[PDB]
């Protein structure tokens, strides 16, 4: 009951000549795959672990100033000299202070002054990098059966976890009773970890863009330092004051942790405390059903009473789940299940948990089906004690069409060109659409990188207005389309 | 004048990209008939087309445990390095960033 009730669940239907289908797995989503004569399976990317990180840079968020010293030079006599100014561990600045007989100098005028203080780091945020070949994606594959899922969450016989790494392009999962499943996932194109940094500040971590991380205006260490005392730009974390031009002072600016939390607004939080593992991103996989057979097809059928132990529950995805218990003999058998009209002339809806069987006859079976819009009747068992449970599905096929179109648009806005690989068979139209999407997305991401959703909306409005007031009818249509897409992306961004 | 290795290769050093557009991979051989040709191809996901050329022409295994590092020029898209034969074949994914 995990892929049922995630609310980010996609039904990929059918395979291609070859028995393979293309699915993109996201961390917060689920993929349930249905093919004719094939068992329904639930796919879930549940972990992405980055191994063997290398620190790219170390930033200073909280510093302290000690050993402050100053030196002065009388006017016209050049610059003051501080011995500390030879130690890069000291932050220094030069200024001018008016001098004279009163200030202990000789001639009158602006005498140079240099103040120095030992910069020390109290708290730092470490940015780490990983090679794409050191990523490990954990994918759970559970056969969509009514079997009791597991003794507990810790160890589940029902679910089969496979680890996907760039080292092997093929991963096999032995689903007991169903054959084997072949996952051929592309870990090199889900996230580009050559442009990404793993930034941990203080028991919190984020997945940030590498250039953004290197453009941060904070003091930093090279990451190969090992000494931790030679910071590159310490002036960003101190302020020198000469208010009246008669005294130079230096103070430390204060902890930059809240400022860094503000700066991290658009990043995705990850876990780096133990293991350096994160839960964001997708994984394009080619699922091969060549060696997936149904389970318990040699069982005959159940000739006995079925009782509903949990009332029919409507799922977030237009599907109903029925929990039934078997009371008859011949314990391992196939549950007679169908969704028909009132007169039972026609089959109206399809079963999601294909080939349902009762194994022990004491353990109930959660059957999931997709009933039709309107009135349907779930017929369970044979006529001697046959169950007939009415159901009404509140919706329409046009509403489902609109919702699916919106879901696909959102997926395209999230996965970009990878959206064409989702549930895709190796069709010509899908390939050409993906090529066009790649080109258009390259142009769009060149034109809109580093802008906020409000800027996106303003630009979309401007472009759509320009298209509306365009002499060319083709230019008008093209500009209006670009503006509408830009407005949609601005609305659907920052998530 | 050698026959294909018909054995199991293992990648002892992951695929490393050079600054010339090619890739170099270090593979050991655990099989019989030590001086044999290495079955190296760079194909697509379905293994229906040959996409790249290995610029280490005719890689061979002189000794069983001695590692050999092949250099190949994959295509600019997504490509797969196939090393070995059906039993224990290695399929290595790779992506080239240029155009």
């Amino acid at each position, epitope marked *: 009951m995990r892929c049922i009730g995630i609310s980010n669940r996609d039904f990929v239907e059918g395979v291609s000549g070859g028995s393979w289908v293309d699915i993109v797995l996201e961390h917060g989503s689920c993929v349930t795959t249905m093919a004719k004569n094939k068992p329904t399976l639930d796919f879930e990317l549940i972990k992405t672990e980055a191994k*063997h990180p290398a620190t790219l840079r170390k930033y200073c968020i909280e510093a302290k100033l000690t050993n402050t010293t100053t030196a002065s030079r009388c006017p016209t006599q050049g610059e003051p000299s501080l011995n500390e100014e030879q130690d890069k561990r000291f932050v220094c600045k030069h200024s001018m202070v008016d001098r004279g007989w009163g200030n202990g100098c000789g001639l009158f005028g602006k005498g140079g002054i240099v103040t120095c203080a030992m910069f020390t780091c109290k708290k730092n945020m470490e940015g780490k990098i990983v090679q794409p070949e050191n990523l490990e994606y954990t994918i759970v594959i559970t056969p969509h059966s009514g079997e009791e899922n597991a003794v507990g969450q810790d160890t589940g016989k029902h679910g089969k976890e496979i680890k996907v790494t760039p080292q092997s392009s093929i991963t096999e999962a032995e689903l007991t009773g169903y054959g084997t499943v072949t996952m051929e996932c592309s870990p090199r194109t889900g996230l580009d970890f050559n442009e990404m940094v793993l930034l941990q500040m203080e028991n919190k971590a984020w997945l940030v863009h590498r250039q953004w991380f290197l453009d941060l205006p904070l003091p930093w260490l090279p990451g190969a330092d*090992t000494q931790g005392s030679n910071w590159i730009q310490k002036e960003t974390l101190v302020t020198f004051k000469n208010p009246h031009a008669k005294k130079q002072d230096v103070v430390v600016l204060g902890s930059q942790e809240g400022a860094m939390h503000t700066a991290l607004t658009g990043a995705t939080e990850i876990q780096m405390s133990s293991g350096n593992l994160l839960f964001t991103g997708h994984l394009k996989c080619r699922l091969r059903m060549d060696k997936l057979q149904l389970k318990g097809m040699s069982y005959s059928m159940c000739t006995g009473k079925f009782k509903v132990v949990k009332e029919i529950a409507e799922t977030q995805h237009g599907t109903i789940v029925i929990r039934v218990q078997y009371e008859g003999d011949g314990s391992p058998c196939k549950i007679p299940f169908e969704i028909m009209d009132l007169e039972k002339r026609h089959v109206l809806g399809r079963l999601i948990t294909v080939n349902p069987i009762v194994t022990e006859k004491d353990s109930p079976v959660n059957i999931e089906a997709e009933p039709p819009f309107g009135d349907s009747y779930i017929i369970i068992g044979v006529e001697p004690g046959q169950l007939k449970l009415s159901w009404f599905k509140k919706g329409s096929s046009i509403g489902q069409m609109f919702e699916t179109t919106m879901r696909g648009a959102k997926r395209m806005a999230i996965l970009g060109d990878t959206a064409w690989d989702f549930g895709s068979l190796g069709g010509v139209f899908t390939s050409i659409g993906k090529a066009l999407h790649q080109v258009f997305g390259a142009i769009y991401g060149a034109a809109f990188s580093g802008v906020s959703w409000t800027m996106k909306i303003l630009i979309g409005v401007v472009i759509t207005w320009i298209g509306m007031n365009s002499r060319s009818t083709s230019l008008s249509v093209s500009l209006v389309l670009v503006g509408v897409v830009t407005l949609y992306l601005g609305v659907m961004v920052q998530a | 004048s050698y026959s294909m290795c018909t054995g199991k290769f*293992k990648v*002892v*050093k992951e695929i490393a990209e050079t600054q010339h557009g090619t890739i170099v991979i270090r593979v050991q051989y655990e099989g019989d008939g030590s001086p044999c040709k290495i079955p190296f191809e760079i194909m697509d996901l379905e293994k229906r087309h040959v996409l790249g050329r290995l610029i280490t022409v005719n890689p061979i295994v002189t000794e069983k*445990d*001695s*590692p050999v590092n092949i250099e190949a020029e994959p295509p600019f898209g997504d490509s797969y390095i196939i090393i070995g034969v059906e039993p224990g074949q290695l399929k290595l994914s790779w992506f080239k960033k240029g155009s």
Partner: antibody
Amino acid sequence: QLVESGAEVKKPGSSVKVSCKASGGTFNNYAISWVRQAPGQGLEWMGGIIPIFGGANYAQKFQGRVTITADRSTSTVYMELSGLRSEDTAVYYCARRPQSIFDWNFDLWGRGTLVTVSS
Amino acid sequence: SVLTQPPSASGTPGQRVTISCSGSSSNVGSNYVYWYQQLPGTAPKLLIYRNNRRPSGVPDRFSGSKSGTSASLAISGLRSEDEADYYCATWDDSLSGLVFGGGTKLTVLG
């Protein structure tokens, strides 16, 4: 062609620097690694460095405790150990190896400097 | 983890003796294996480099063996000279450092 520093007797909690002077050919063509062998114990690898390149790498056990550096002007390699303690007592060796990332064949060795942590 | 090696080795002069060093998929069987002879009060000497290739210094009687995930050093003829501590050093990809074995002290009877 590889000459190490003389014997050094130290005290607990201190830091010790060991000198390994290589020739010109070994400085510009080979790497140098630091292996310390504790009294009545097996060899242990501390770290190494390509003197011409100078980027030093250390065993995970010695992160933040061993510093290895080269003096290209005098053609010398130094190992500095911080937090000297009772278990840090051992003989220390500098060995000459190629700078490839696959071959660690030490065809040259020094003579070992006995860093005796005692009185 | 580290290359497990036999602490105790015993042989007799004129007899061929070999030492076994077993590592992991990242210690041995994925990287060259080097064998070193370390007599008391002397620095270790490189016995066999690469995967059991004799440097010119070591006599032909010395030799080594390498397998899928373990290595071995072969001694053609035996003497009291082979009474020393033996170490198998190999780069570990996971450990990211040259990890020797536990050290084998070979004892020669006589």
